[PDB]
Design an enzyme around this catalytic site. Structure first.
Site, PDB file in Angstrom:
ATOM      1  N   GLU A  36       2.071 -34.034  -4.645  1.00 58.52           N
ATOM      2  CA  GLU A  36       0.891 -33.393  -5.196  1.00 58.52           C
ATOM      3  C   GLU A  36       1.238 -32.708  -6.513  1.00 58.52           C
ATOM      4  O   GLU A  36       2.403 -32.438  -6.816  1.00 58.52           O
ATOM      5  CB  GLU A  36       0.318 -32.383  -4.203  1.00 58.52           C
ATOM      6  N   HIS A  69       0.803  -1.217   0.000  1.00 59.68           N
ATOM      7  CA  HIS A  69       0.000   0.000   0.000  1.00 59.68           C
ATOM      8  C   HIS A  69       0.837   1.270   0.000  1.00 59.68           C
ATOM      9  O   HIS A  69       0.348   2.314  -0.442  1.00 59.68           O
ATOM     10  CB  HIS A  69      -0.938   0.007   1.202  1.00 59.68           C
ATOM     11  N   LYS A  72     -15.476  -5.858  -8.753  1.00 60.88           N
ATOM     12  CA  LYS A  72     -14.637  -6.603  -9.688  1.00 60.88           C
ATOM     13  C   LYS A  72     -14.052  -7.848  -9.026  1.00 60.88           C
ATOM     14  O   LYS A  72     -14.103  -8.951  -9.586  1.00 60.88           O
ATOM     15  CB  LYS A  72     -13.529  -5.698 -10.222  1.00 60.88           C
ATOM     16  N   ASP A  73     -13.512  -7.695  -7.817  1.00 64.61           N
ATOM     17  CA  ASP A  73     -12.947  -8.834  -7.109  1.00 64.61           C
ATOM     18  C   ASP A  73     -14.033  -9.789  -6.643  1.00 64.61           C
ATOM     19  O   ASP A  73     -13.789 -10.989  -6.505  1.00 64.61           O
ATOM     20  CB  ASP A  73     -12.113  -8.348  -5.931  1.00 64.61           C
ATOM     21  N   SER A 101       0.080   0.357  -6.740  1.00 65.21           N
ATOM     22  CA  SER A 101       0.055  -0.896  -7.476  1.00 65.21           C
ATOM     23  C   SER A 101       0.622  -0.665  -8.868  1.00 65.21           C
ATOM     24  O   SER A 101       0.639   0.457  -9.376  1.00 65.21           O
ATOM     25  CB  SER A 101      -1.360  -1.475  -7.566  1.00 65.21           C
TER      26      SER A 101
HETATM   27  C1  HEM Z   1      -0.185 -16.038   0.414  1.00 61.20           C
HETATM   28  C2  HEM Z   1      -0.441 -15.742  -0.855  1.00 61.20           C
HETATM   29  C3  HEM Z   1      -0.501 -14.335  -1.277  1.00 61.20           C
HETATM   30  C4  HEM Z   1      -1.460 -13.428  -0.962  1.00 61.20           C
HETATM   31  C5  HEM Z   1      -2.675 -13.661  -0.107  1.00 61.20           C
HETATM   32  C6  HEM Z   1      -1.098 -12.211  -1.587  1.00 61.20           C
HETATM   33  C7  HEM Z   1      -1.883 -11.064  -1.470  1.00 61.20           C
HETATM   34  C8  HEM Z   1      -1.712 -10.010  -2.335  1.00 61.20           C
HETATM   35  C9  HEM Z   1      -2.707  -9.083  -2.680  1.00 61.20           C
HETATM   36  C10 HEM Z   1      -4.116  -9.057  -2.158  1.00 61.20           C
HETATM   37  C11 HEM Z   1      -2.166  -8.214  -3.563  1.00 61.20           C
HETATM   38  C12 HEM Z   1      -2.878  -7.047  -4.187  1.00 61.20           C
HETATM   39  C13 HEM Z   1      -3.635  -7.493  -5.437  1.00 61.20           C
HETATM   40  C14 HEM Z   1      -2.686  -7.584  -6.599  1.00 61.20           C
HETATM   41  O1  HEM Z   1      -1.906  -6.639  -6.843  1.00 61.20           O
HETATM   42  O2  HEM Z   1      -2.680  -8.601  -7.325  1.00 61.20           O
HETATM   43  C15 HEM Z   1      -0.831  -8.599  -3.777  1.00 61.20           C
HETATM   44  C16 HEM Z   1       0.039  -7.945  -4.612  1.00 61.20           C
HETATM   45  C17 HEM Z   1       1.313  -8.436  -4.848  1.00 61.20           C
HETATM   46  N1  HEM Z   1       1.858  -9.583  -4.426  1.00 61.20           N
HETATM   47 FE1  HEM Z   1       0.997 -10.860  -3.379  1.00 61.20          FE
HETATM   48  N2  HEM Z   1       0.042 -12.366  -2.271  1.00 61.20           N
HETATM   49  C18 HEM Z   1       0.470 -13.629  -2.135  1.00 61.20           C
HETATM   50  C19 HEM Z   1       1.603 -14.248  -2.660  1.00 61.20           C
HETATM   51  C20 HEM Z   1       2.572 -13.551  -3.363  1.00 61.20           C
HETATM   52  C21 HEM Z   1       3.702 -14.111  -3.969  1.00 61.20           C
HETATM   53  C22 HEM Z   1       4.084 -15.565  -3.975  1.00 61.20           C
HETATM   54  C23 HEM Z   1       4.402 -13.079  -4.561  1.00 61.20           C
HETATM   55  C24 HEM Z   1       5.657 -13.196  -5.314  1.00 61.20           C
HETATM   56  C25 HEM Z   1       6.771 -13.553  -4.691  1.00 61.20           C
HETATM   57  C26 HEM Z   1       3.682 -11.885  -4.307  1.00 61.20           C
HETATM   58  C27 HEM Z   1       4.055 -10.642  -4.738  1.00 61.20           C
HETATM   59  C28 HEM Z   1       3.108  -9.638  -4.901  1.00 61.20           C
HETATM   60  C29 HEM Z   1       3.395  -8.439  -5.687  1.00 61.20           C
HETATM   61  C30 HEM Z   1       4.684  -8.112  -6.387  1.00 61.20           C
HETATM   62  C31 HEM Z   1       2.284  -7.692  -5.652  1.00 61.20           C
HETATM   63  C32 HEM Z   1       2.072  -6.357  -6.310  1.00 61.20           C
HETATM   64  C33 HEM Z   1       1.354  -6.577  -7.640  1.00 61.20           C
HETATM   65  C34 HEM Z   1       0.820  -5.264  -8.138  1.00 61.20           C
HETATM   66  O3  HEM Z   1       0.042  -4.596  -7.425  1.00 61.20           O
HETATM   67  O4  HEM Z   1       1.154  -4.843  -9.265  1.00 61.20           O
HETATM   68  N3  HEM Z   1       2.570 -12.207  -3.586  1.00 61.20           N
HETATM   69  N4  HEM Z   1      -0.569  -9.711  -3.022  1.00 61.20           N
END
Ligand code: HEM
Ligand SMILES: CCCCCCCCCCCCCCCCCC(=O)OC[C@H](COP(=O)([O-])OCC(O)COP(=O)([O-])OC[C@@H](COC(=O)CCCCCCCCCCCCCCCCC)OC(=O)CCCCCCCCCCCCCCCCC)OC(=O)CCCCCCCCCCCCCCCCC
Ligand SMILES: CCCCCCCCCCCCCCCCCC(=O)OC[C@H](COP(=O)([O-])OCC(O)COP(=O)([O-])OC[C@@H](COC(=O)CCCCCCCCCCCCCCCCC)OC(=O)CCCCCCCCCCCCCCCCC)OC(=O)CCCCCCCCCCCCCCCCC
Ligand SMILES: CCCCCCCCCCCCCCCCCC(=O)OC[C@H](COP(=O)([O-])OCC[N+](C)(C)C)OC(=O)CCCCCCCCCCCCCCCCC
Ligand SMILES: CCCCCCCCCCCCCCCCCC(=O)OC[C@H](COP(=O)(O)OCCN)OC(=O)CCCCCCCCCCCCCCCCC
Ligand SMILES: CCCCCCCCCCCCCCCCCC(=O)OC[C@H](COP(=O)(O)OCCN)OC(=O)CCCCCCCCCCCCCCCCC
Ligand SMILES: CCCCCCCCCCCCCCCCCC(=O)OC[C@H](COP(=O)(O)OCCN)OC(=O)CCCCCCCCCCCCCCCCC
Ligand SMILES: CCCCCCCCCCCCCCCCCC(=O)OC[C@H](COP(=O)(O)OCCN)OC(=O)CCCCCCCCCCCCCCCCC
Ligand code: HEC
Ligand code: HEM
Ligand code: HEM
Ligand code: FES
Lengths: 32, 56, 65, 239, 51, 98, 379, 74, 54, 54, 54
Positions: free
Chosen positions: G271, G201, G227-228, G205
């Protein structure tokens, strides 16, 4: 220059009821 | 219009909206359950227990 | 009692794929039989025939049952 | 090596919204009762599960009453026999697991409570394996007491041929041909592995209709709220 | 990256080597003490009697 | 000639289809915001409107009509002179640091 | 005097984290997966608890208790298969989320990227310990193989392996500690997801174009909530189709066999969502090298913010990089399939080539290609 | 990051209409299908080839397993 | 474990000719798709009635 | 709540599951407690605001 | 374990068999009492010095 500001034509998106420019909007607001 | 009457009779107030939703769900549960069960029994006619309880 | 499975086998062994699998099977049969000390087993061509026959049999049969 | 995968038979429940033919389930339970239960075992399902599926309550309690079941300690700590009740699991033919191997050649009969859902291939396998017995091909000799079955991995099963035509008499009166017996017992085993099959299909039908209703409406709501942004018209008027 | 190194960084490294080496010794002693690393502890005189 | 390959890559990148220019798509690293801040007022306003229009187009998954595409010969590197100065200043600061 | 939404402390946090959060106006459907994972997480917790109330983590009763859940507990089968297929959906969304982050240059967010990597590792650990609980043949033997993997580490080795085992091998104690670790871990995942959102935040994004979207931010609540919600409805559609029409589609049948340690199943595969690692395991002949490659396959995501050399954040305007990324994805599916298959002549060489390509694209092809693109575009 | 200090704009005008005045599906199929076709044309030449070569590799390996599996005449 | 010939067989005390995986006096499989012979456990051989086995 | 007609296996298992999960809810609630506390500061024994002496 | 048949015995296995198990078990049992002692003293402190005004 503020007078030159004109809203573009939205008739491609307006619903059928609110399409004519001389038919008010309150009469169809309830339906929409 | 019927839709306009429905709106400014039963949709304007959010509390009336909630009451409408509640009664609509009350009737929709019964209607949907009846319809889906009837369809599913129609597809498998003679293959369910309820269709062969009479024999035994 | 005549088992419908046997009749399905009989009519379904006519499919020309079954014909080639079967003739290959005897072509394994006499080769293995004549050769005294040989480790070859006709289970390979037998499995080919079984697959070819049983796909067809699965297509049929259950209608009669 | 090599293994022969079972052909995809046209099962009655193969359909996307199809249900097990419960009459065939009753016949398959008969087959298990007087054929498979002699040496094969089924534990996780009980007579209670039979009601409302293939047998009525009276028939199920009679079926349970037929067998004899060991109970808890007596008034002095003895192992007294007792007529089985609806809340009794299906009796195990051999008391200890090793005794099953000892009675047989040495391979214990696997429990059928999940054999449909544990064997790769499903009913098509369990069906075909029964209706797949044949004389071994030339050049492969089998041990004494072993039997050749192409579908069984290793092609060497320890089963005496279990299902042969005119083995049992169905209560309904359908012909006892080997294929019919195999099909009905296979359907019963599928029910044993997945008792909730019919309910699962019913709920799946409900889910399909409910989502086909909701998804267009929620998409319409999304379009409604986003239409402010999908119809905006920008303008640039630098001085 | 190559943006580092040069005149000023080498005497920084030289100045901080004694402290970094002492911290490494701290880590080594803490590790051998924490897990009761036998291999080292059959050599220090008074603690040999622990085993 | 190499210019043919450059034209091909420019057309394949597709940022011209959105009305954007090369310097409108550069990742904003620490030097880039400083370079942008030094831009004159008119260039900054044009840049921000162009980026806003590009975001508007991508929200609807649409592109500019074929006529209003930034042709490869009309593309201007407005940011490049400022970015070069920012990078040179950073290099000079680094060299004095070592 | 002031709106409660932005004056009450908890309400203020909720407001500036989910309601009035400025988000880019053109984030595609891929961004929706960020929500879905979180929802999946809740769906994993809320369903999982209801399995813990009829599951006994004892070798003598674990499998019997699970069968009792599926056959005697009212609507228990729904909970069990919802849980399993929801874990599969969780991994699907996780992989798609990582793909989105890698594609649209999101790894410049650094802190969020590293927290995401930690979350990913924790989720794989959670699923690994989870598969063991039914105590089937595949559960038992996959646990045996994966734990015996750790014997390759030098020196400590067997001692660490038996420490995890709580004995000479997997047994009742191992099952119990796996159950307890499995219970605790998802709450750590939840806290880490909160930290992930907190870090995200501060900067906003990444929109698909990759340019800063401070000139097109929109309030979150009116648009992205719905949307979500649509995204979550689609995910529920897929998950419910899987549960109610082919519950064991992504599942080995042999797990429906009580774990007998005296019989090795003919096939021993983890798995479906672990095979890409396991295949890499099969590629390296050396055991220590195999384990190092297995961990490096997932650890390589940390190097990504350092390996990006193109002057464009996103990949939307970079064709050759796009082709390289899709080749990487295809290589990932190839690795999954290879891990599924046994280890013979047709598959060994394919696995070696797939592993080499998977590392080469990330570490070599992508940066050099970015240099080529920068040169080709006059910068 | 809250609204108010996001960026600086000048001379930018945004016209917009109420969601209750527009149709939520304006030319859904008339304009949607050409746009989807254009997007597919733009993306397919980059996304398809890796998956088609994956399919070739998968089929080749799957057929390779059997003939190494098959009986050797000897 | 397909019906092995325990304590007997043409070979030594082990034999399992369900499949190609036969056995030997030392336990070695003559042939077969068995991953290995009868599994040998680490026995810290002191002597008879003193050997440590797990 | 009994999961039946008395305290039995079902009740024991549910109690174990709730005993496992609940302390994490307690942790979250304690974090909320500290959050609410920090917006006003702690209270001294004297009751008077301690803003001058911090 | 969380089964009626093997609950109590399992606890004994914690006290009698697990290396340093009795210490963990009785640490939990008495830490519950310490938790409640501190909870009651905290509630009393809130009542006394008027901290409930928050
Ligand atoms: C436990 C699983 C995960 C949850 C619940 C989670 C949750 C979130 C959420 C809600 C967002 C904002 C929505 C979005 O931008 O798509 C986000 C953004 C992001 N997450 Fe995750 N995430 C998870 C796993 C990961 C993993 C494995 C990575 C990569 C190593 C990661 C890296 C990022 C990045 C780089 C963003 C920014 C994307 C953007 O806003 O352009 N996340 N995450
Ligand atoms: C007709 C020929 C086939 C066209 C579709 C296949 C294809 O390659 O299209 C590429 C073509 C060009 O890609 P693009 O729109 O430039 O990039 C994708 C968007 O950035 C991001 O996607 P988007 O937001 O523009 O469109 C969302 C799209 C696809 O949504 C997603 O891909 C994300 C969620 C679904 C994942 C995959 C599920 C299967 O939705 C659908 O395809 C229908 C509903 C699917 C479930 C809900 C979403 O895109 C489409 O045709 C639609 C999106 C992809 C569909 C697959
Ligand atoms: C896997 C995990 C589970 C799935 C996760 C899904 C996550 C995303 C959920 C939200 C979502 O779908 O966002 C993408 C996307 C957001 O854009 P949109 O609200 O469709 O508006 C059109 C776009 O501006 C793009 O408009 P356009 O330039 O493509 O032309 C207008 C329109 C017309 O084209 C079509 O509708 C495509 C042809 C089929 C009719 O395009 C679409 O509707 C494209 C989407 C396919 C329908 O929505 C969809 O992909 C629609 C889903 C399918 C319709 C609802 C179910 C029936
Ligand atoms: C994880 C969950 C599953 C996956 C996600 C999908 C969840 C389901 C789909 C989304 C459902 C969202 C809620 C339904 C739509 C809705 O009410 O939007 C709010 C809408 C948005 O605004 P609105 O303008 O549409 O409605 C309010 C205005 N009037 C009253 C004039 C219509 O607001 C309301 O509906 C307010 C009234 C709600 C009344 C609820 C009564 C419930 C009674 C039974 C309890
Ligand atoms: C919450 C918001 C919604 C979340 C998603 C809900 C499920 C998917 C919704 C779309 C499809 C709905 C289909 C449907 O409801 O079909 C009917 C079916 C039950 O059918 P039947 O068993 O015949 O009973 C009918 C009479 N009750 O219905 C079902 O079988 C339901 C679908 C399967 C179960 C999915 C559950 C997902 C959400 C779980 C939330 C749990 C909350 C628990 C809260 C704490 C409780 C202590
Ligand atoms: C992870 C840390 C280890 C956790 C398990 C503890 C036991 C262990 O694996 O090693 C303990 C070992 C004790 O000493 P040890 O090495 O056994 O002395 C005789 C050597 N022949 O001590 C060590 O192995 C200490 C060094 C551990 C780190 C590797 C170097
Ligand atoms: C199969 C892939 C999914 C179906 C849709 C086809 C597709 O992905 O097309 C690529 C799409 C192209 O559109 P765009 O993101 O704007 O990239 C530049 C276009 N000139 O670009 C994207 O869709 C990029 C999405 C990247 C993350 C999701 C895909 C990878 C998942 C890995 C697991
Ligand atoms: C305990 C015995 C010592 C004790 O509490 O003595 C009283 C003393 C008073 O301290 P103070 O408020 O400075 O006195 C001012 C006098 N003009 O100290 C106090 O009054 C402080 C102790 C009372 C408030 C703190 C919480 C503990 C209260 C007793 C147990 C609470 C739990 C059970 C009851 C609920
Ligand atoms: C009667 C209706 C049936 C059905 C449906 C089955 N059996 Fe048997 N069985 C027996 C022995 C000794 C074995 C072990 C052989 C081995 O697996 O190596 C078996 C095995 C099975 C299986 C498992 C096959 C697999 O793929 O592993 C199945 C599905 C099976 N059986 C079904 C012995 C007997 C026996 C008397 C000794 C009788 C009668 C049956 N079986 C009857 C049936
Ligand atoms: C991070 C999210 C989670 C994942 C990925 C996950 C994964 C899994 C998997 C793959 C299984 C095996 C299911 C099967 O084979 O049938 C499983 C079982 C189980 N999980 Fe989880 N799980 C998660 C969260 C939880 C939580 C939060 C709990 C506790 C509340 C929990 C408790 C259980 C239990 C008790 C079982 C055994 C029930 C069964 O036999 O299926 N899980 N989990
Ligand atoms: C889960 C157990 C609890 C934890 C971990 C907890 C935590 C804390 C902490 C760390 C403080 C600050 C230190 C202090 O002033 O004592 C605090 C303050 C406070 N807590 Fe709690 N608390 C708990 C239970 C309670 C209970 C049961 C109440 C009463 C209903 C309560 C009411 C308060 C009040 C009123 C304060 C402010 C005291 C002051 O400012 O002087 N707490 N809490
Ligand atoms: S069972 Fe003894 S080797 Fe196959």
């Amino acid at each position: 220059s503020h007078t030159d500001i004109r809203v573009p034509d939205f008739s491609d998106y307006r619903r059928a009821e609110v399409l004519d420019s001389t038919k008010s909007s309150k009469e169809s607001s309830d339906a929409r | 219009t019927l839709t306009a009457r429905l709106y400014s009779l039963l949709f304007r107030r959010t509390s009336t909206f909630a009451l409408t939703i509640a009664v609509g769900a009350l009737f929709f549960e019964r209607a949907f359950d009846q319809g889906a069960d009837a369809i599913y029994e129609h597809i498998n006619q003679g293959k369910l227990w309820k269709h062969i309880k009479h024999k035994y | 009692l005549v088992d419908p499975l046997t009749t399905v086998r009989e009519q379904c062994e006519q499919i020309e794929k079954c014909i080639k699998a079967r003739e290959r099977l005897e072509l394994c049969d006499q080769r293995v039989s004549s050769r005294s000390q040989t480790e070859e087993d006709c289970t390979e061509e037998l499995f080919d025939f079984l697959h070819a026959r049983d796909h067809c049999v699965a297509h049929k049969l259950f209608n009669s049952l | 090596d090599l293994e022969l995968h079972a052909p995809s038979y046209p099962w009655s429940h193969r359909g996307l919204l199809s249900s097990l033919d419960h009459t065939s389930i009753r016949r398959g339970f008969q087959v298990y009762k007087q054929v498979c239960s002699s040496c094969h075992s089924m534990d996780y399902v009980a007579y209670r599960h039979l009601v409302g599926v293939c047998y009525t309550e009276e028939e199920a309690k009679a079926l349970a009453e037929e067998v004899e079941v060991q109970d808890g300690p007596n008034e002095d700590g003895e192992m007294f026999m007792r007529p089985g009740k609806l809340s009794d699991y299906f009796p195990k033919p051999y008391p200890n697991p090793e005794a099953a191997r000892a009675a047989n050649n040495g391979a214990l009969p696997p429990d059928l409570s999940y054999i449909v859902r544990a064997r790769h291939g499903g009913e098509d396998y369990v069906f075909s394996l029964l209706t797949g017995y044949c004389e071994p091909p030339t050049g492969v000799s089998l041990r004494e007491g072993l039997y050749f079955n192409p579908y069984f991995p290793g092609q060497a099963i320890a089963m005496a041929p279990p299902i042969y035509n005119e083995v049992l008499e169905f209560d309904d009166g359908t012909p006892a041909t080997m294929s019919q017996v195999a099909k009905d017992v296979c359907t019963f085993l599928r029910w044993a592995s997945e008792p909730e099959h019919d309910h699962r299909k019913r709920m799946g039908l409900k889910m399909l209709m409910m989502m086909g209703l909701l998804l267009p409406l929620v998409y319409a709501m999304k379009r409604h709220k986003w239409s402010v942004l999908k119809s905006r018209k920008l303008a640039y008027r630098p001085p | 990256l190559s943006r580092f190194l040069g005149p000023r960084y080498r005497e920084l490294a030289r100045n901080w080597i004694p402290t970094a080496s002492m911290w490494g010794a701290v880590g080594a002693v803490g590790l051998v003490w924490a897990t009761d690393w036998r291999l080292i502890l059959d050599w220090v005189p008074y603690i040999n009697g622990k085993f | 000639w190499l210019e043919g390959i450059r034209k091909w890559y420019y057309n394949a990148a597709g940022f011209n289809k959105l009305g954007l220019m090369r310097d409108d798509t550069i990742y904003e690293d620490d030097d880039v915001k400083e370079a942008i801040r030094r831009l004159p007022e008119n260039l900054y306003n044009d840049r921000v409107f162009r980026i806003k229009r590009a975001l508007d187009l991508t929200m609807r998954q649409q592109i500019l009509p074929k006529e209003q595409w930034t042709k490869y010969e009309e593309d201007k590197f407005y940011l490049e002179p400022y970015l070069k100065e920012v990078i040179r200043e950073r290099k000079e600061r680094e060299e004095w640091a070592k | 005097m002031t709106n409660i939404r932005k004056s009450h402390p908890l309400m203020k946090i909720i407001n500036n984290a989910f309601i009035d959060l400025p988000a880019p106006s053109n984030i595609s459907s891929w961004w929706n997966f960020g929500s879905l994972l979180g929802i999946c997480l809740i769906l994993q917790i809320l369903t999982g608890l209801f399995l813990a109330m009829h599951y006994t983590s004892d070798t003598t009763t674990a499998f019997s208790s699970v069968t009792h859940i599926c056959r005697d507990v009212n609507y228990g089968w729904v909970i069990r298969y919802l849980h399993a297929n929801g874990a599969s959906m969780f991994f699907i969304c996780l992989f798609i989320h990582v793909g989105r982050g890698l594609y649209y240059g999101s790894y410049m967010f650094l802190e969020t990227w590293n927290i995401g990597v930690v979350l990913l590792f924790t989720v794989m650990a959670t699923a690994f310990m989870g598969y063991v609980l039914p105590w089937g043949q595949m559960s038992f033997w996959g646990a045996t193989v994966i734990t015996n993997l750790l014997s390759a580490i030098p020196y400590i080795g067997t001692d660490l392996v038996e420490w995890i085992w709580g004995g000479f091998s997997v047994d009742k104690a191992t099952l119990t500690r796996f159950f307890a670790f499995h219970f605790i871990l998802p709450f750590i995942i939840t806290a880490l997801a909160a930290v992930h959102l907190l870090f995200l935040h501060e900067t906003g994004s990444n929109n698909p174009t990759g340019i800063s979207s401070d000139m097109d931010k929109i309030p979150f609540h009116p648009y992205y909530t719905i949307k979500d919600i649509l995204g979550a409805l689609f995910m529920m559609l897929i998950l419910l189709i899987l549960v109610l029409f082919s519950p064991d589609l992504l599942g080995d049948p042999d797990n429906y066999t009580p774990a007998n340690p005296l019989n090795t199943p003919p096939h021993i595969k983890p798995e479906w969502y672990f095979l890409f690692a396991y295949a890499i395991l099969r590629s390296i002949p050396n055991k220590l090298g195999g384990v190092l490659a297995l961990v490096a396959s997932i650890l390589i995501l940390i190097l990504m913010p350092m390996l990006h050399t193109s002057k464009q954040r996103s990949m939307m305007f970079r064709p050759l990089s796009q082709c390289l990324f899709w080749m990487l994805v295809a290589d990932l599916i190839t690795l999954t399939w290879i891990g599924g298959q046994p280890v013979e002549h047709p598959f060994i060489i394919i696995g070696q080539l797939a592993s080499i390509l998977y590392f080469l694209i990330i570490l070599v092809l992508m940066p050099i290609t970015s240099i080529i693109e920068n040169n080709l575009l006059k910068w | 990051r809250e609204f108010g200090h996001l960026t600086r704009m000048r001379h930018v005008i945004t016209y917009s209409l109420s969601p209750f005045e527009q149709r939520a599906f304006p030319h859904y199929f008339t304009k949607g299908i050409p746009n989807v076709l254009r997007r597919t044309r733009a993306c397919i030449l980059r996304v398809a080839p890796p998956f088609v070569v994956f399919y070739l590799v998968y089929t080749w390996g799957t057929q390779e397993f059997e003939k190494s599996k098959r009986k050797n005449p000897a | 474990g397909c019906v092995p010939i325990a304590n007997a067989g043409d070979f030594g005390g082990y034999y399992c000719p369900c499949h190609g995986s036969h056995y030997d006096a030392s336990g070695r499989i003559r042939k077969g798709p068995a991953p290995l012979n009868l599994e040998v456990p680490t026995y810290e051989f002191t002597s008879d009635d003193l050997v440590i086995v797990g």
